[PDB]
Amino acid sequence: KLSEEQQHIIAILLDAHHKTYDPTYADFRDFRPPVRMPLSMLPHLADLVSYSIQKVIGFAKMIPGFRDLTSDDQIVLLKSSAIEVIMLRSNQSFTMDDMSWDCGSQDYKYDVTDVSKAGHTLELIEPLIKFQVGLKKLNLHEEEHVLLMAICIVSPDRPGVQDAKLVEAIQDRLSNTLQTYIRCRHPPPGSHQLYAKMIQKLADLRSLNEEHSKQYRSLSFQPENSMKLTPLVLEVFGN
């Protein structure tokens, strides 16, 4: 039942991920360096998020049907989903062992206290960790992981969407791809309710999104902190 179009979609999204996710973490030495020994980690982690946004954009451009949207709608969708896709794609380096994101080295291994040192509180960090745990336990196929990222970006209910009709139809082809993939290539019992569970993770991300933007607006209302951000982070997340 996995149609030729559907196998096509999966091939494109896998490739788009491998082109925008480098598991060597080579570029990390270009960021402002991490400091731990004051929002110590805000320069290094703002650099990471700004880099990650560019990677998310390059992925979104390759999602089939996305380019048939207008640039206004594309902007809307990326502005709303950027932090969610970043949290979701960070799951690949997350290790449940010491509850940290191990991106290669110890300098580039981040725990909950590093996230605190960028200005964020456990109001965000506590659901964020349980999010990463629950995703980690879904044991997702790479096929499913990249479909989930695509569905996240192309959402019809984002605030300010203009052609909700076209956005809905683009998402629908991706959701139907995912549902058929699960049915055909994911054996029970891991397949049990798997689609519903993945959609629950998107709901987890809407809540995480709202809390991020509250603490961001608090953070960036202090001009001392705005100064440590990047111009892309400011345009996307605000002010």
């Binding site: 560019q54 390059g58 451009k61 640039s71 902007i75 990326l78 502005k79 892309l232 345009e235 996307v236």
Partner: peptide, 10 residues
Amino acid sequence: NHPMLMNLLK
């Protein structure tokens, strides 16, 4: 109001 976004989106 989004110069860098639109440049990155091609």
